[PDB]
Design an enzyme around this catalytic site. Structure first.
Site, PDB file in Angstrom:
ATOM      1  N   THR A  71       0.840  -1.202   0.000  1.00 25.71           N
ATOM      2  CA  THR A  71       0.000   0.000   0.000  1.00 25.71           C
ATOM      3  C   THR A  71       0.875   1.252   0.000  1.00 25.71           C
ATOM      4  O   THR A  71       2.063   1.185   0.306  1.00 25.71           O
ATOM      5  CB  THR A  71      -0.963   0.051   1.212  1.00 25.71           C
ATOM      6  OG1 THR A  71      -0.222   0.242   2.423  1.00 25.71           O
ATOM      7  CG2 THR A  71      -1.789  -1.230   1.319  1.00 25.71           C
ATOM      8  N   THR A  72       0.281   2.391  -0.340  1.00 18.43           N
ATOM      9  CA  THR A  72       1.032   3.638  -0.452  1.00 18.43           C
ATOM     10  C   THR A  72       1.289   4.257   0.923  1.00 18.43           C
ATOM     11  O   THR A  72       0.393   4.315   1.766  1.00 18.43           O
ATOM     12  CB  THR A  72       0.301   4.665  -1.343  1.00 18.43           C
ATOM     13  OG1 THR A  72      -0.141   4.031  -2.552  1.00 18.43           O
ATOM     14  CG2 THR A  72       1.224   5.832  -1.695  1.00 18.43           C
TER      15      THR A  72
END
Ligand SMILES: [Cl-]
Ligand SMILES: [Mg+2]
Ligand SMILES: [Mg+2]
Lengths: 244, 243, 111, 241, 231, 195, 240, 250, 235
Positions: free
Chosen positions: B30-31
């Site tokens: 995920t970012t």
């Protein structure tokens, strides 16, 4: 991990042989021939140096024949560097025994321990075995004169006459032909040299390609003497038997 | 070939393929981002809501080291936790011997050397995380980003994960539009916007926003989580910008 | 030289009936000629209907009780919640005590 | 062919892992250069900061190992910093044990010995770096000693490292053919830095701004790096001649 | 393929196949369900037998008076991990006179599992765990995966056909979360949840295993005739 | 601890060792055999600290018996005595040394000669015609210095030994409850039952 | 330390390293054990491709573990020395702590345990050796004969053979050995042992070793002439 | 972590060859030529200084090294392997001899110790053999002057004269024609320079050639006076100038 | 090759699965639990007629209240038995009581997965552990090299296991007497054995609360074999 690069030096083949021991013996079969002959009044050690160069210093050289103590010597066939590791261990072991019991070590006890060390490298540790076969020549007051051999497997056996290294098959047949039990040292000297002369891969056997030693009771009264032959002495003994 | 089957092996290029393979695990994650500001740093991360059954606010991903450093990462989450645990040991021993809390550049190298050590042997695996971290020390604010190879640099802004390129582009605009500097409270708002914009690259599952910050004036140089009114204010700012 | 032992005084008493048993102990705790506490209990319910007191040096007494209580906990975990009989507890405490034969718990214990 | 994966000999007596570590050296695409003055030793290196988000002050391949010794690295930064930390620790221990500052050449030998071990021991990989150590030694004077992944090391009159190292090397060779001496015959370190940059410009064929370069200078009793403005001051001096 | 010989190797797409194969052992395991309200947390587990002559493999293990878990996958690995939790809970009590937070319990398991995925010679744990507990911040439910990933949830399920119960709980979320101060109803919801994962077999008296912990309830397990109430 | 004596004569070694085991103010036993056969033609008597004595004696016995089986051969008395000395010489610098004094009586079959070795707990070895450990020597040595001949028979040696025991029974403060006497010669080891 | 698991299971459930160790035993010189009414006899083949041997000093095939128990083997000679040494040390250790020599069963159980340990320890290969262990328990006159093998299994035998062509001599013993009436005397037992080796050996010259163990530590090895008399007698009865 | 390579990396092949030793010898073959000649009153060891770059200062790289005051060494093959062997060789001369007997080891025994170190790299876990052949020249009171060759296997041989490396085959043949048992030290130096010119291609002077002798004691190189028994090192490295003097009368 | 502790793509440990194949090659062992006791029976299976069958020891005492039968690589069982006996006696020393049969079994099964790269491979032997304690009464456990153990009312392991287990499924009920169980083990052993069953190639044993664990004499088993043959002919 590192499993990828492991040769597994201490495993069995499907036929129940130890790969590395078999291949070490194959290595030893290309080494210069060494012969031991046991007579009633002494032992002869004879060995052929590996293809010599004329600029090699011959007198201050030791390649085949080593002294373990005053009563025991060995002839080497295989990797010299490997042999020296084992020889130093054998020398120390002999001194440990002398320190403990105040008596010189019996030949078999020394041979067994050295052979046990070799055995260990074939069963555990994952290291390559020692690429060395020994001929042990020695004396003690229990069995008198004794010849033994050990090989990379750590198996040892006693002999009246034996060869290790190159052309053992041909050498053993020749020894088996001319050996007899009432033989003397000077006869054994001649047999050893004659056998090497016929089994050699060289053109002609000369003094500079040989190491020679005797273990006699030819000192003065009830004591044993080790004689590692000098170059000139090998030259003389080669003439005396009419090989050159 | 076979050069990629074992860690610490150089390929004929001079590359460690196992580290490059660890990078792929990071790109899959995920970012997460980091924004450096006037007197501190701000961290934010995308938390994918896999199911309704996840308890909101209760799977915290940002981690504190000592009392003044924050750490966030993308990729294999357990690997990141292992790195932070080491970071905490490193920071504790530094404070034990030298009294003063560990400086951020000092701390950055402690993680760097440790991650680099996991590229030296075939008996260990490289870290499957890129870690964005930083805080405030005696020399002001510092932001860092550390990669599986052990490589790290100081950053004005940093981003990693599946939406890194989107986030990077948005970070570059802030650096250009604010040469004098961004304030801490502004950086919190911007962090929210960028996570929402970077969520376009992961838009199947909707997400939960998590922010933290260290600021000399706003948090007194300590790491704190952004919660309640300040969090909702930042969420609303982000919601207004996507529409 | 540092003396690792102390004497916290007090006294305890255990009597057994036909279908019951009592374990009593005063609540005073002392060092030398000073009172530390007028109410510091040293008789404890250890679970499985076993009460225990280790009187003498309170630090060793508390450590032993703490270890035995913990021994009861793990006896349940390892043997399907089986009840620890009083005779089994006694034997277990012997091993706790003798384990420190050359640096003893300075206490007289009663259960 | 597992003889290419670990540091054992190939049939032709080569160590491929060592050879591939040499190729990792150029992975950064940065060229370095070192020269000696009368009183000083100057090292310069290219500084490429491609990302706008990077803090340019933290991007460096020059390290202050001790008060007297400096080191520039050609290779990836993780291995570079690994080498730097060890060098710092080694130099500190030397001083404590033996009562005097570790010489540049002795540190070079020590780091070269460590590198050699990685070429012989299987579990440790070589570091993909080339280390150039610089100082003004109290016995030997201005000194440049360089280490590589093979464990090789030697002193230099001057040296260069990187992808376009050969162009810089021959450029320096041709100068020392002309000058007939072992060093830059110059009083101040400022002009030796100017020489270093000038000859790098000629060899590479590129112009440099203040942020395209990185400069380390060793004098008696201290090694120091230059700021962007120190380099800018130096660039202006070259341009006005 | 070429990258699944050990846990220390990454695949070209950044996968750890040994960890994924360990995950596969959980999928073969018998279904177990976890769910909670604000006052209680409940585990429900379908036990599995070898045949009609054998006992039913116990799925639920107590860790402390306030904590415990259920297992799916390699049972010996669950024994190792549960034993570790028992010690960590115990250390917290002896040293700090403090009941171990269910969240810390999760963090500790994550870190223990992780170390087995980064070193040569070892292997990942081959079991998934559902940890329930009641601590100073109320009731909790955790899901442990041997990848190291630990997740706090209102409800969940792991094992074969766990997707049925997991979908059900996702629908029932708003209902069962507000079953406060009523143990038997929270269990009923969990027993109905695990029923969505059954095929050809139904819940019998020596088949069903239920555990509960809460505000005024120590972690206790129900087997045999004590679960007949819920069939 | 107590009276262990040794006399080497023409054709045999004779060892005499007291029978008493005393602890405190009580004689616990009056028939104790303070000796071990190490090999068919080697006997060791011992004397020293309680527990240490038998523990050491049996440990030596095991080692010599192990050697005998391995080599199918009996070590010479000289070789055995050197082994024993080294073990004690190791022991004296250990954390807890063996406090044991020994006499080793053996018949060397290769030399056809009896041999008596005296070794104390420090590892101090000597070959002697006659030996003793403890306070026993303070009485018997002047007696042996006088009456001993190197060409004595086994019977003459036993009479010489009776003279020593008589002197000890007269002038020694304790009751050591007599001695067990054993003879080591070409035919091995045997015990004199009536002494 | 070298750790590799060398002995491991294969898909079919075999441990090949243990099974290949048995092939080493099959290559070794034949060894046979036969127990009578009041004795056990251990016979051993010695290959005759080795002339110029010194039989005084060459390691004997039958080894005394204690004064009352003996051990012969088939397989790797170097491996057997390690087992014999360990057995001899345990024999003395048993006498020291129990104050009684080992039983033949106990000594066998120990040797077999050592062999088993080398089949699931890291970094080691199994022993390429099978043993025949024979003797009499202290103060007992019942003959004992046991066999061990690389896997670690051991068992008691009325008569047994191991090594090369052991299947041929086992065949012989299976029809020539009566359980109801074992060889009543020493002579009968030695003869049946020599007969069984003559099915496989070649010449009855310096190829056969015979060791006789009787109760109360009564062990003696036969000389060439003594054995040759059995060889001569058997052949004359055969021509019929 | 930790060295998991506890197994041999050098093993016997079916034909009996030890592959890694053979390949190490191949690396020695590629190495620059070095040689040694034994005279009646001294020994000379020599080699070419192959410069890696003309900017490199070849004086800082010493191919010929002092091991003890009476023993020196030169090599062919891999330089880094040689450098660490010299470090280990110098130390072992002290630890296993001088710190015990209060005097330096005789040549044969120091050689024996170096050989042991090289043998172990052929058998121990997780290491490759050393990729060098050494020539060790030295003197001691009871053996006089001697010259030894040590190979990657750990084998060592005494020589009257020999060469190793690139053009060793031709160089050995050259030495056979010129060597006699009456050579004086200066005659041996002359032959050494002649033999080396054949294998050297580029510049042939005192800056490209490295040469040292084992000869008479050098009291001027001792660094102190007052102890009659201490008379100075027999090892001496010839200077760049001293070599050029002999290259004129060549 | 490959790691010893490697998972297959189906989520099973290769070495554990392969050791299960070794156990299938082993001789048959059967156990039946009743309220009057637990019976353990094994096929001896002598490889040759010269081998003295009474030296084949595949049924073994762990304590007075716990017995054990084995199948597979039986040499591997020695250290398992040694551990079991020590565990049983040690617990008695620490707690002045008999150790529960389940606790004993769990202790033995803790050894199982202690292999890898600890021992080099899993055990190649399965155990049937039978005993009695005051809490759970008469119990029979099947201990595998996976580290898993199931309690059984009846269980067969070894080469004839799947056939014998199917037979045990039909025959077992909760009211079996000890004598009925004895005959049932003999009957099912005779069915799956290669050679004809007698007192020399099969062995019986039992554990009862009163008399503890007992291995039956060859004379006692022979009479039960004769009683079994007569009863099958009687209808
Ligand atoms: Cl170094
Ligand atoms: Mg390496
Ligand atoms: Mg004395």
């Amino acid at each position: 991990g590192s499993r990828r690069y492991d040769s597994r030096t201490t495993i069995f083949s499907p036929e129940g042989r130890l790969y590395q021991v078999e291949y070490a013996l194959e290595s030893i079969s290309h080494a210069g021939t060494a012969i031991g002959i046991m007579a009633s009044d002494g032992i002869v050690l004879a060995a052929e140096r590996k293809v010599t160069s004329t600029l090699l210093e011959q007198d201050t050289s030791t390649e085949k024949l080593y002294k373990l103590n005053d009563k025991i010597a060995v002839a080497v066939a295989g990797l010299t560097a490997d042999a020296e590791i084992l020889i130093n261990t054998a020398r120390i072991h002999a001194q440990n025994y002398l320190k403990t019991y105040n008596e010189d070590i019996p030949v078999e006890i020394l041979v067994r321990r050295l052979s046990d060390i070799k055995q260990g490298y074939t069963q555990h540790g994952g290291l390559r075995p020692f690429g060395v076969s020994f001929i042990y020549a020695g004396y003690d007051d229990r069995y008198g004169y004794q010849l033994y051999t050990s090989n990379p497997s750590g198996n040892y056996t006693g002999w009246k006459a034996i060869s290790v290294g190159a052309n053992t098959s041909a050498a053993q047949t020749l020894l088996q032909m001319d050996y007899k039990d009432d033989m003397k040292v000077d006869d054994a000297i001649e047999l050893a040299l004659k056998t090497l002369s016929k089994t050699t891969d060289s053109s002609a056997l000369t003094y500079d390609r040989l190491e020679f030693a005797t273990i006699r009771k030819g000192a003065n009264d009830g004591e044993v003497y080790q004689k590692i032959f000098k170059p000139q002495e090998i030259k003389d003994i080669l003439v005396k038997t009419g090989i050159t | 070939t076979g050069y990629d089957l074992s860690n610490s092996v150089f390929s004929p290029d001079g590359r460690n393929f196992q580290v490059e393979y660890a990078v792929k695990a990071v790109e899959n994650g995920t970012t997460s981002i980091g924004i450096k500001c006037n007197d501190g740093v701000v961290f934010a991360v995308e938390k994918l809501i896999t199911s309704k059954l996840l308890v909101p606010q209760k799977n915290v991903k940002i981690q504190v080291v000592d009392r003044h450093i924050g750490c966030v990462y993308s990729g294999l989450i357990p690997d990141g936790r292992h790195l932070v645990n080491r970071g905490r040991e490193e920071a504790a021993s530094f404070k034990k011997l030298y009294k003063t809390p560990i400086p951020i550049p000092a701390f950055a190298d402690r993680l760097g050397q440790y991650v680099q050590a996991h590229t030296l042997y075939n008996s260990v695996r490289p870290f499957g995380v890129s870690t964005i971290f930083g805080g405030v020390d005696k020399n002001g604010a510092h932001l860092y980003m550390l990669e599986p190879s052990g490589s790290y640099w100081g950053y004005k802004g940093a981003a990693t994960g599946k939406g890194r390129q989107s986030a990077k582009a948005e970070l570059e605009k802030l650096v250009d539009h604010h040469p004098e500097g961004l304030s801490a409270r502004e950086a919190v708002k911007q962090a929210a916007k960028i996570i929402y914009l970077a969520h376009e690259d992961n838009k199947e599952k909707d997400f939960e926003l998590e922010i933290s910050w260290c600021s000399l004036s706003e948090t007194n140089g300590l790491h704190k989580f952004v919660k309640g009114d300040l969090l909702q204010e930042a969420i609303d700012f982000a919601q207004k910008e996507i529409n | 030289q540092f003396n690792p032992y102390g004497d916290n005084g007090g006294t305890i008493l255990g009597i057994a009936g036909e279908d019951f048993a009592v374990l009593a102990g005063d609540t005073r705790n002392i060092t030398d000629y000073s009172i530390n506490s007028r109410y510091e209990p040293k008789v404890f319910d250890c679970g499985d209907n076993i009460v225990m007191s280790a009187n003498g040096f309170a630090a060793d007494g508390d450590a032993l009780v703490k270890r035995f209580k913990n021994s009861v906990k793990w006896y349940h975990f390892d043997h399907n919640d089986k009840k620890l009989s009083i005779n089994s507890a006694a034997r277990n405490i012997q091993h706790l005590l003798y384990g420190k034969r050359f640096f003893p718990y300075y206490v007289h214990t009663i259960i | 062919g597992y003889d290419r994966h670990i540091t054992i000999f190939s049939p032709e007596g080569r160590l491929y892992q060592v050879e591939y570590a040499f190729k990792a050296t150029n992975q950064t695409n940065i060229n370095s250069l070192a020269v000696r003055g009368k009183d000083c030793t100057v090292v310069i290196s290219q500084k490429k900061v491609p990302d706008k988000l990077l803090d340019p002050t933290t991007v460096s391949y020059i390290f202050c190992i001790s008060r007297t010794i400096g080191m520039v690295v050609n290779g990836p930064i993780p291995d570079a910093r690994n080498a730097a930390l060890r060098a710092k620790a080694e130099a500190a221990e030397f001083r404590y044990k033996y009562g005097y500052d570790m010489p540049c050449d002795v540190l070079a030998k020590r780091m070269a010995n460590l590198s050699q071990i990685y070429t012989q021991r299987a579990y440790m990989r070589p570091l993909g770096v080339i280390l150039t150590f610089v100082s003004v030694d109290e016995e030997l004077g201005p000194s440049i000693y360089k280490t590589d992944p093979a464990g090789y090391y030697v002193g230099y009159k001057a040296t260069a490292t990187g992808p376009k190292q050969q162009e810089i090397t021959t450029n320096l060779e041709n100068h020392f053919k002309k000058s007939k001496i072992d060093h830059i015959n110059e009083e101040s370190w400022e002009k030796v830095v100017e020489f270093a940059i000038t000859h790098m410009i000629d060899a590479l064929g590129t112009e440099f701004s203040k942020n395209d370069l990185e400069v380390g200078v060793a004098t008696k009793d201290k090694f120091f790096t230059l700021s962007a403005e120190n380099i800018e001051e130096r660039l202006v001096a070259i341009a006005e001649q | 393929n070429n990258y699944d010989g050990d846990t220390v190797t990454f695949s070209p797409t950044g996968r750890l196949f040994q960890v994924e194969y360990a995950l596969e052992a959980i999928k073969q395991g018998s279904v177990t369900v976890g769910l909670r309200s604000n006052t209680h947390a409940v585990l429900v587990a379908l036990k599995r037998n070898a045949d009609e002559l054998s006992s039913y493999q116990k799925k639920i293990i107590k860790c402390d008076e306030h904590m415990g878990l259920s297992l799916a996958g390699l049972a010996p690995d669950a024994r190792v991990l549960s034993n570790y939790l028992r010690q960590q809970c115990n250390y917290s009590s002896l040293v700090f006179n403090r009941k171990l937070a269910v969240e810390r319990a999760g963090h500790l398991l994550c870190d223990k599992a992780q170390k087995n995925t980064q070193s040569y010679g070892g292997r990942p744990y081959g079991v998934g765990l559902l940890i329930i507990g009641y601590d100073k911040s109320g009731a909790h439910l955790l899901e442990f995966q041997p990848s190291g990933n630990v997740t706090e949830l209102y409800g969940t399920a792991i094992g074969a056909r766990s997707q049925g119960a997991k979908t059900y709980l996702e629908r029932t979320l708003d209902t069962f979360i507000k079953i406060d101060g009523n143990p038997d109803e929270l269990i009923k919801a969990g027993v109905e949840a695990i029923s969505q994962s059954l095929r050809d077999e139904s819940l019998t008296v020596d088949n069903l295993s239920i555990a509960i912990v809460g505000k005024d309830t120590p972690f206790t397990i129900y087997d045999g005739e004590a679960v007949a109430k819920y069939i | 601890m107590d009276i262990i004596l040794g006399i080497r004569v023409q054709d045999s070694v004779i060892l005499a060792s007291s029978k008493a085991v005393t602890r405190g103010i009580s004689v616990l036993k009056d028939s104790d055999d303070k000796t071990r056969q190490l090999s068919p033609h080697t006997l060791m008597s011992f004397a020293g600290e309680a527990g240490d004595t038998v523990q050491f004696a049996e440990y030596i016995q095991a080692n010599i018996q192990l050697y005998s089986i391995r080599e199918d051969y009996e070590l010479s008395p000289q070789a055995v005595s050197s082994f024993v000395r080294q073990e004690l010489a190791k022991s004296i610098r250990s954390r807890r040394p063996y406090q044991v004094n020994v006499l080793i009586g053996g018949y060397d079959k290769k030399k056809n000669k009896p041999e008596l070795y005296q070794i104390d707990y420090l590892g101090t070895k000597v070959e002697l015609p006659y030996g003793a450990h403890g306070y026993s020597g303070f009485y018997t040595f002047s007696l042996l210095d006088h009456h001993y001949r190197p060409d004595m028979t086994t019977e003459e040696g036993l009479d010489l030994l009776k003279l020593c025991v008589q002197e000890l029974e007269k002038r020694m403060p304790m009751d050591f409850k007599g001695v067990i006497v054993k003879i080591v010669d070409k035919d091995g080891i045997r015990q004199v039952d009536d002494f | 330390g070298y750790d590799r698991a060398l002995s491991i299971f294969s898909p079919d459930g075999h441990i090949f390293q243990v099974e290949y160790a048995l092939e080493a035993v099959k290559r070794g010189t034949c060894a046979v054990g036969v127990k009578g009414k009041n004795c056990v006899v251990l016979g051993c083949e010695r290959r005759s491709t080795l002339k110029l041997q010194d039989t005084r000093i060459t390691p004997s095939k039958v080894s005394k573990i204690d004064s009352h128990v003996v051990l012969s083997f088939s397989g790797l000679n170097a491996d057997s020395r390690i087992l014999i040494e360990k057995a001899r040390v345990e024999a003395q250790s048993h006498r020291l702590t129990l104050e009684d020599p080992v039983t033949v069963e106990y000594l066998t159980r120990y040797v077999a345990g050592v062999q088993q340990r080398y089949t699931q320890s890291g970094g080691v290969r199994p022993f390429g050796v099978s043993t025949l262990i024979a003797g009499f328990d202290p103060r007992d006159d019942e003959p004992k004969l046991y066999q061990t093998e690389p896997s670690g299994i051991y068992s008691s035998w009325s008569a047994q053979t191991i090594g090369r062509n052991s299947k041929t001599v086992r065949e012989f013993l299976e029809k020539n050995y009566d359980r109801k009436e074992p060889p009543a005397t020493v002579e009968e037992c030695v003869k049946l042992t020599v007969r069984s080796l003559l099915e496989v050996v070649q010449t009855g010259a310096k190829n056969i070793e015979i060791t006789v163990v009787k109760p109360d530590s009564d062990i003696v090895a036969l000389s060439s002439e003594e054995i040759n008399q059995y060889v001569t007698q058997i052949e004359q009865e055969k021509q019929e | 972590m930790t060295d998991r390579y506890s197994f041999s990396l050098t093993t016997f092949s079916p034909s009996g060859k030890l592959g890694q030793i053979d390949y190490a010898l191949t690396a020695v073959k590629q190495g620059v030529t070095s040689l040694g000649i034994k005279a009646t009153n001294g020994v000379v060891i020599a080699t070419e200084k192959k410069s890696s770059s003309p900017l490199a200062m070849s004086e800082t790289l010493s191919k010929v090294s002092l091991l003890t005051p009476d023993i020196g060494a030169v090599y062919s093959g891999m330089g880094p392997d040689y450098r660490v062997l010299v470090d280990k060789s110098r130390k072992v001369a002290h630890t296993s001899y001088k710190r015990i007997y209060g005097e330096y080891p005789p040549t044969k025994l120091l050689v024996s110790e170096v050989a042991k170190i090289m043998q172990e790299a052929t058998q121990s876990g997780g290491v490759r053999p050393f990729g060098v052949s050494l020539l060790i020249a030295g003197h001691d009171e009871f053996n006089g002057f001697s010259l030894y060759q040590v190979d990657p296997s750990g084998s060592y041989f005494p020589w009257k004269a020999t060469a190793i490396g690139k053009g060793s085959v031709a160089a050995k043949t050259f030495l056979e024609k010129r060597w006699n048992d009456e050579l004086e030290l200066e005659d041996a130096i002359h032959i050494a320079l002649l033999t080396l010119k054949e294998s050297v291609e580029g510049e042939f002077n005192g800056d490209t050639i490295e040469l040292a002798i084992i000869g008479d004691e050098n009291p001027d190189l001792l660094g102190y006076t007052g102890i009659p028994t201490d008379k100075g090192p027999r090892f001496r490295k010839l200077t760049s100038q001293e070599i050029n003097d002999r290259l004129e009368a060549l | 090759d490959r790691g010893v502790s490697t998972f297959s793509p189906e989520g099973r440990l290769f070495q554990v699965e392969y050791s299960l194949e070794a156990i299938k090659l082993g001789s048959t062992a059967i156990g039946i639990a009743t309220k009057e006791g637990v019976v353990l029976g094994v096929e001896k299976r002598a490889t040759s007629p010269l081998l003295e069958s009474d030296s084949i020891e595949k049924i073994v005492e762990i304590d007075r209240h716990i017995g054990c039968a084995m199948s597979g690589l039986t040499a591997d069982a020695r250290s398992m038995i040694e551990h079991a006996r020590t565990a049983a006696v040690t617990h008695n020393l620490y707690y002045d009581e008999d150790i529960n049969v389940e606790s004993l079994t769990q202790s033995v099964c803790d050894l199982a997965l202690r292999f890898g790269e600890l021992m080099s491979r899993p055990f190649g032997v399965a155990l049937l552990i039978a005993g009695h304690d005051a809490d759970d009464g008469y119990q029979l456990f099947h201990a595998e090299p996976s580290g898993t153990f199931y309690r059984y009312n009846a269980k067969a392991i070894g080469s004839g296991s799947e056939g014998a287990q199917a037979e045990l499924l039909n025959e077992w009920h909760s009211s079996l007497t000890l004598k009925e169980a004895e005959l049932l083990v003999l009957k099912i052993l005779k069915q799956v054995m290669e050679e004809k069953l007698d007192e020399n190639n099969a062995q019986l044993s039992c554990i009862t609360k009163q008399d503890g664990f007992k291995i039956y004499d060859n004379e006692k088993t022979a009479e039960l074999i004769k009683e079994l043959k007569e009863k099958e002919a009687a209808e």
